[PDB]
Amino acid sequence: NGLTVLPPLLTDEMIAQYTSALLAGTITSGWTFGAGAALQIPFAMQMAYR
Amino acid sequence: PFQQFGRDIADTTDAVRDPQTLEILDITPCSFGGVSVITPGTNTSNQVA
Numbered sequence: 001n002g003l004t005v006l007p008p009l010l011t012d013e014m015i016a017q018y019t020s021a022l023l024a025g026t027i028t029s030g031w032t033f034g035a036g037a038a039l040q041i042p043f044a045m046q047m048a049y050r
Numbered sequence: 051p052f053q054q055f056g057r058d059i060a061d062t063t064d065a066v067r068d069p070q071t072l073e074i075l076d077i078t079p080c081s082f083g084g085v086s087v088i089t090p091g092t093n094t095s096n097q098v099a
């Protein structure tokens with residue numbers, strides 16, 4: 001009744017790619033993708049770090 | 051058999067019986083929305099979408 005709803009800029013599919021990207025960085029490369037490029041490290045050694 | 055019109059969750063009439071037949075018609079409000087103009091800077095072009 002004169003009210004309108006507007007779509008989000010990022011779709012649920014685009015948000016699901018960002019949550020996959022943050023997760024795939026976090027699994028393969030620790031915190032390093034938050035400092036520069038993702039540097040790979042074996043996951044047992046990333047937990048040994050943590 | 052006695053019902054003449056129908057309402058949405060919040061007051062608004064959303065269906066009507068034709069009184070000459072018995073058909074039930076849904077009502078959809080008029081299409082409306084913001085006109086928005088998509089543009090480069092006027093310093094670089096005057097084409098718009």
Ligand SMILES: *[C@@H]1O[C@H](CO)[C@@H](O)[C@H](O)[C@H]1NC(C)=O
Pocket residue numbers: 069070071
């Ligand atoms: C109304 O009249 C039409 C014919 O013009 C008819 O087809 C329809 O069944 C009638 N409806 C009633 C009984 O009100």
